[PDB]
Ligand binder design. Structure first.
Ligand SMILES: OC[C@H]1O[C@H](O[C@H]2[C@H](O)[C@@H](O)[C@H](O)O[C@@H]2CO)[C@H](O)[C@@H](O)[C@@H]1O
Length: 383
């Protein structure tokens, strides 16, 4: 057999290792050995590996990181193999995800999936508080008021759960709020972005969200929602299958509330891309593996609750009512997602945003000072 290696953050029950097990069973002359990364290690360490000669054949890389590797020659140019493919077609892909694998008019990967975040809510806790579970919050004011009503320390419940962690989690969580109020990562210190960061301060200052929001991932925050310890959760479709298993209450999911009535919806484009490292000894076999993964995209939602990065295969209902309502919401919010980048310096941009979030939420800097400092850094690095 040709033996390939593949690195991803996907947990044992998420797509990558399960796709690998199905692929290996084909006995097609190719085998894949999986290594699970940690979220926080996929990047500067996979760059270390590439630079030393320790890189795998294949990686699933977060979409905003793709340009760093592609621009540096770390990823294989798959343009010709895509053109020849009878399985992968570039016109199948949503334009944002496709753009994220491109550099200088060449393809340097194939999108794996796509997502964005939305607002989960526990309808039983809404009802118990005298709230209308059929009318979840539409604006930031309504969201904050609901979160106040739902915050009940005597019952071990926070009104809301989210993530402000000092890594890509916090940036991905924050950008939607800043964008809805008219800012972007290229202009992150507008009065609207300040208002977004003030609103986060309110959530923490009034103890409507756990203080662990500052250090806790989206996944670990949503676990608290699933357990009934937070009445609402801002997170992605990657939560659905676990929530179905673990949440023992009635729940819904809706679009992210907007800053003023009928202000624009907005969020950030999530999820990963497949890429082949440039010095692979097995480019054809690695690409065959990615063709196989792409061939399974049609089953991704039903089997894993994640969303393909493709317009050719709109996701059908599963038949589970909760899951199908979540699908409708995520499909609708995704229509408002904006890309982080393209930028080969995304991590530096993101770090500037992370530091502003931490500076303001900790009370060390005002929101305005914090975001002014981020914007100055971004102006330099995004040049
Ligand atoms: O933390 C920011 C990133 O959030 C998501 O990444 C998910 C991943 O999709 C999911 O499978 C998993 O269980 O964990 C992380 C969430 O904690 C987005 O997909 C990324 O694009 C974001 O940058």
């Amino acid at each position: 057999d040709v033996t390939l290696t593949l690195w991803s953050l996907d947990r044992d029950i998420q797509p990558a290792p399960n796709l690998i097990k199905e692929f290996n069973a084909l006995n097609n002359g190719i085998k894949i050995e999986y290594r699970q990364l940690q979220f926080d290690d996929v990047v500067s360490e996979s760059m270390r590996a590439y630079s030393t000669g320790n890189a795998p054949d294949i990686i699933a890389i977060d979409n905003p990181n793709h340009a760093m590797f592609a621009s540096r020659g770390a990823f294989l140019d798959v343009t010709d193999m895509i053109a020849k493919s009878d399985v992968i077609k570039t016109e199948n892909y949503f334009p944002g995800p496709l753009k994220s694998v491109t550099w200088d008019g060449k393809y340097f990967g194939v999108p794996k999936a796509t997502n964005t975040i939305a607002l989960y809510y526990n309808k039983d806790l809404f009802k118990a508080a005298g709230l209308d579970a059929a009318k979840p919050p539409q604006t930031w004011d309504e969201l904050v008021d609901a979160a106040r009503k739902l915050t009940n320390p005597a019952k071990n419940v926070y009104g809301i759960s989210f993530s402000a962690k000092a890594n890509e989690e916090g940036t991905f969580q924050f950008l939607p709020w800043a964008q809805m109020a008219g800012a972007t990562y290229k202009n992150i210190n507008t009065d609207g972005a300040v208002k977004a960061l003030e609103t986060w301060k309110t959530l923490l200052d009034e103890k409507l969200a756990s203080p662990d929001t500052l250090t806790r991932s989206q996944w670990d925050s949503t676990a608290t929602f699933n357990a009934g310890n937070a009445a609402m959760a801002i997170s992605g479709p990657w939560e659905i299958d676990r929530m179905l298993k673990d949440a023992k209450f009635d729940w819904g999911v809706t679009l992210l509330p907007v800053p003023t009535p009928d202000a624009p919806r907005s969020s950030a484009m999530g999820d990963y891309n497949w890429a082949i490292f440039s010095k692979t000894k097995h480019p054809a076999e690695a690409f065959k593996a990615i063709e196989f993964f792409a061939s399974k995209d049609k089953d991704m939602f039903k089997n894993f609750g994640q969303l393909p990065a493709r317009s050719d295969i709109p996701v059908p209902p599963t038949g589970n009512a909760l899951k199908d309502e979540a699908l409708k919401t995520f499909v609708e919010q995704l229509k408002y997602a904006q890309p982080r980048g393209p930028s080969p310096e995304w991590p530096k941009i993101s770090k500037a945003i992370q530091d502003a979030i931490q500076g303001a939420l900790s009370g060390q800097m005002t929101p305005k000072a914090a975001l002014d400092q981020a914007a100055e850094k971004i102006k330099l690095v995004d040049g």
